[PDB]
DNA sequence: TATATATATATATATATATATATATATATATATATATATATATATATATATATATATATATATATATATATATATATATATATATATATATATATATATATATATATATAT
DNA sequence: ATATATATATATATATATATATATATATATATATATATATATATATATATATATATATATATATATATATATATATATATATATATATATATATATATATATATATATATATA
């Protein structure tokens, strides 16, 4: 017993991880180039769109999990994020009753759910214009943030769920962390990639 | 892909494709090696025939579900676009509540694909003989709701 | 291709060519081993002939209908090309308005169908005799339609 | 259940993948150069005409498909922009009362219909020159489409599919986005491509 | 129902269709490079003759048909004109006669015939010039172009088909759209298919 | 990866993947060239099948755990999440304390896995009925410690 | 330089020319010895694909803004010339105001660039018909503003 | 250059004369070294592909003038010179006032042209049967202006 | 130099800046032939990616402080000129106190900071919706402080 | 390697493994052609299987030891560390003294080993009821010791 | 067609030359091979034990990394399947006729 | 016979057009939804392996020593002798081809007119 403790994350390999396992199943498809430019697009768009929203929340919001229900038991903290990005946020299909409603059913404390809520609009507001404008200029909190997500989500219809999917972000370029303004801060990361190939002779 | 009654020949589709799928998964780059071998060839095989059958299993539900939607579209003549909605319509309940009880009200769901069908829930439509009928989608809605927890036996 | 008169043989001819698209399909690139194996070629040998018969079951009311069409083409002397196009028309409305019910009415298809044959719709044939006779298009599409419906006993 | 939310469209990948599927399945009848051409010349033609057509027809209106009948339920909506493509625009098979009857029989409010079949029109004649002659210099609107559309349409006779399909572009010359004129806007999305195989040592 | 709207017409891979799926047969036949040569050779002499024939005539009267029975009921006028440049021309085997009585018989106005006879011979003076030289320097009209055709086919015999099969164009060279003269204008389409290898790395 | 139920497809998948990892444990660089020998083929496919046969049989105690996790929750009405959390947790008890036996009491393992489910532990659950139940962690963290003992007859 | 509409061929020759720039950069003097070095030379190379991308990156914006800019001009027809002057107002206003937001009001630089335009405000075009038209400059100014505005969903 | 006929020749030529220009270009002196280079080399041929992509395809409406003046001219039996004349006459008209539409009328562009042409204007020429005729230039340059504005259905 | 964000161009152009003062320093008068060799070369190159490793290394603090002190200006809406003021601020405090201590009291820093930041530290600061604000100097200096301390968890 | 107990699993992973060496220390240099043929090819795997039956053969006596020390174990309470400790040193005794006896006596390994375990040797051990119990390394070790005679009937 | 320039080719005798071949012996130089023994050099091998460096194996536990496998749900990327309709593309299949192309069948003359 | 031409004509199927239309399947959109996967997170827990340590042992192998001996082959000598080749010189003589002469022609190209 107690064989390991594994460690699930985004480990700045899990790009060649999926890139290569999938090249490989997909040669016996393919071909040689046609599965190289096969996998390429698929992780872009993975990327693209799934790390660029997705892990950027978890980054940010952990410390505030950690704090109030610091457990391995944050399982239903995520979800619940998860569902927060898809099934309210760039889709409009739930109003903020229904996750309230569905957590405390599943023992979730309703202000718990209702900062967390704050947090993620406060910050997929300023990752995508859209629900930034959606929103307005309005600091969510857990006395505001259920009547104002309402308000948004009741106004608005059921969005297609292609607006979650890809073209939100395709239709609208942004500032990058490559430009003046507040695009100025974060190429670090991305500094290091660099480093790495000048080592690698590459 | 286009729209087709499931048949025997979806099956044997879906194993076929999955035999490819495999042979593809097990040799990662030696595909032709492991190709050529006919015992690997036959754990494939027999792979692929488990995952279909495990697929065929986990689908009569929906299939009873999109039967009985088929029924309530054409006694109320209901065009094709949104017998097929019903159809998911009942799957997602059947799935989501009925099954598994994920925790959330029925009619909270009722709301929500109400909400999806809006545009505003009273829709007209002109049958064969041009006689013009309105149906609710909500009373609708709600009839196979009941009639579904009558198909389970809840 | 060419026109051929529906038998046994173009049965025949569908089922092997359908052999080749799935051997094509299954080993998507290594179709050299997935065609030295015997257990995968049974396999694609029944979809195929699975395949066949879905298409065969589903095409007796097209034929039926060119039937038709050809009896009543003889019965009014009309040369082949609109013995075909007729045929084609029968297809179309038994399609898109006897089976589905596609949200049109009938006429709607008859005065289409008769702007496809403008150029008006009564036209001059010559018969085997040298007697030329004249016919109205949209009558003679009336005409099966009665026929037509005649046939499915709607 | 709910196992995933997939998402339908033009990622930037549908290339690749219907070059990559039908050469895999066409070796098997062609060998491996022919079946690479076949490929080759196949999706060029669905790209030119499809794609140049049909995709940017989509784009355009799906905005105002939501504010419309924002739902998921849209998919009439879409039915209806490609039988107005098809059958109104480029073949002239039947008139707007065709289709306006056939759609509020399916439940479609008629102004709706009037409204979307004027927008299609106001960019068909974009994108097709043939259109753009055939309904002259009219801004299309719900209270004047219907009219306009049935005089074209009966002054033409029922046109073969085989303009449709790809003689239409094929006769005919357009200006391409890489030109003077009205033709230095777009090719922003090509731009990507390029900087794409630069970065892969292409 | 209303499956699809298939349209059949040369798509620039015809070619490619034609040699690989005859190549795939005669495998069983003949061998690799002998399969490969009969292909190259069958595909050749069905371009230079069908395609620079018919191909060209049918581009040039679909308009002209549109007009005239603007239908998918012209296939009529399609069968008129391939026997045109096969019983009458290049065989003489027909006065116009047998045309008219045959296609008004099967309910074709007889000016139209006409019209359409005119039409097809004074292209094919163009394309063939030994039919140029026996009908020499008149252009037929529904006026006189029975009257001239039936002078020229009665003054000839019944010629054996192997003149219009292959061996017309064979035993004579013509001017190419490759030189000065009245061949300086078309290989626009030829120039595609050089920028086209040039992409695909070849 | 997403949750599966266990079954033989679950089997037939670790067999052909521990094919691939074996053929690429052999030829470190030669793959290709003992990809090609039908006898270290032979040898490798054994060794893949005794590979899962291991971790075939030394996996049912922690199905009989996961079993009777699935009773206690399905009687006391809990969500699936701490379905699979209390899961694991029998798990661990069965494994560091009842089989090996790594040198520490129960009950400390009991607080600590308290301390894990806090945020205190008794948690409110909303039935399908919308009746509320709560249930305390660390009694039901007890209650199936005891019958855990009952099923290895501790 | 000649106005060019963008295209791959630009990013490539922007490319190439900052190859050639590196490669003056990097040997000060003894660039004929850095020139003969593969390894420096892969390095600029990468370098110079850097700063494409870079600036590639960083002009999608003031794309939009040429195009919203060409697709009113159209609509109001006015000659090539004035449509690159809006153009360029409004990459300013996007620029000074939108993203970084320099402390000037936007009614501000409107009136500036108002003066930029004056020679006064409402100019006459001749159409293609011969039919003259007349556009105030302010208004449409302030038309795309809003226009602006809308694509970033200011 | 010679009158040469557009061939595939023609856009090979292109082809390799921009490659030399381009590694003209990037190596401003140190050719030599980048011409060494097979990366940089690729990158030079990729660049000048594309450049002859957009040369080819920024010609077609040009080529289709120079076919229809060739058409013309051959109905009316104009010496070869007179031709190339017409077709750089409809060059030029497609280009300033089909397409941009710089802010001239089309009759002034006419008269233009008409002073081009004139030395007047109704020029004789001998057929090679003998038979002299006589043709207006401004008739046939009012000719294929419509026939022009036909092609782009203008 | 202007402004620019940090980049991997920005790594790329310390590497080969310093490759051209390294070939400088070697070979201090010869510089050729040192040039010419490849050995020293590729020592050269190795040494100037040491160095580019070493100041990259050398970064993250700063570069993390001028991120807390971009959020701190983001949040209080500040003109750029004094965000970079304030990063450079807390990069001295965090460099002379936090990470070497050398002996000077963090109030000291403060109030030297506050006499550069004079003229007296309450500024008025118009935001693009036209209402004017103020904000303290030395308060937002006091928050920054704790703020970094929170950082680096001081 | 992390303790896996011995199984058929072991025999054939050092199999392959002994190929991959065998493989590689025939053809030092030219390991691809040797790679290649299947004569060698069948060479080397009869010779590592024989090097496997060798490794085998030579390994049961370790086996029963570590089995009686397990048992001894088992008895006395001892935690899994020390249970594979007295394993080695078990083997160790029959290796050296037992089966070759180099030069020395059995209680100076005894005193050697006693060295080895002290820190002294009367170690406490908590069982699972509570119970703390005391154990003399010394006296175990000699216990083993005679046990061990026991089993090679000496 | 006419030159000249040399490139080869086919018809009969001299070069240096090597292509060799033989056919006869004699050399030196060498590649090997024996036949007896002797070295040094290194290739393994066995004998006994000792090191070091590794390759695995086990014996207990602990890591990180990973390959999977579950157990709960949530994503993303897909692979299919369905339910509704619509495309384009192509696989066939009809229904009428027309081509070319070639696959075989039906009237006399050559290979 | 099989197969190829030289005319006339079928049927048959190989494709290709020329229109209309099916059904089927190949993909692709368009929305809703499954189900099965391929991965990726998110926590918890296994199990199995790939490694890495953390100690103690094995066996096995790879090398290296530390002595003694083999046998085997790698070379090198030590002497006598072969045999086979690599050349070389001796003399005589063929044939073959590779260049150069010594005449007469070709044909073929490289040029030049």
């Known amino acids: 017993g107690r064989q390991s403790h594994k460690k699930i994350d985004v480990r700045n390999d899990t790009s060649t991880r999926y890139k290569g396992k999938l090249y490989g199943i997909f040669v016996n498809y393919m071909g040689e180039k046609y599965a190289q430019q096969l996998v390429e697009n698929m992780y872009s768009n993975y990327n693209d769109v799934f790390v660029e929203i997705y892990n950027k929340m978890h980054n940010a919001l952990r410390p505030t999990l950690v704090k109030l229900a610091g457990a391995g038991a944050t399982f239903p903290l995520w979800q619940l994020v998860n569902e927060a990005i898809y099934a309210v946020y760039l889709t409009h299909k739930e109003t ?5 409603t569905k957590y405390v059913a599943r023992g979730v404390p309703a202000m718990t759910v209702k900062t967390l809520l704050a947090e993620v609009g406060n910050q997929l507001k300023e990752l995508v214009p859209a629900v930034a404008e959606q929103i307005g200029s309005v600091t969510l909190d857990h006395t505001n943030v259920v009547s104002t997500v309402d308000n948004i989500v009741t106004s608005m219809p059921a969005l297609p769920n292609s607006y979650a999917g890809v073209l939100m972000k395709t239709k609208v370029p942004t500032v990058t962390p490559h430009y003046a303004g507040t695009g100025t801060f974060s190429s670090m990361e991305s500094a290091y990639k660099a480093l790495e190939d000048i080592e690698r002779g590459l | 892909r286009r729209n087709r009654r499931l048949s025997s020949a979806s099956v044997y589709r879906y194993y076929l494709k999955r035999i490819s799928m495999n042979i593809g998964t097990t040799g990662h780059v030696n595909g032709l090696s492991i190709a050529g071998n006919p015992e690997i060839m036959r754990a494939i095989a027999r792979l692929s025939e488990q995952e279909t059958y495990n697929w065929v299993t986990d689908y009569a539900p929906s299939h009873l579900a999109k039967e009985v939607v088929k029924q309530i579209s054409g006694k109320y003549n209901i065009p094709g676009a949104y017998q097929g909605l019903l159809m998911a319509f009942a799957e997602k309940v059947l799935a989501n509540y009925i099954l598994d009880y994920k925790g959330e009200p029925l009619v909270e769901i009722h709301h929500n694909f109400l909400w999806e069908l809006m545009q505003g829930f009273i829709y007209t439509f002109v049958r064969k003989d041009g006689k013009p009928v309105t149906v609710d989608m909500s009373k609708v809605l709600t009839e196979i709701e009941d009639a579904l927890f009558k198909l389970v036996k809840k």
């Open chain 1, 96 to 100: 903020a009753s229904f996750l309230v």
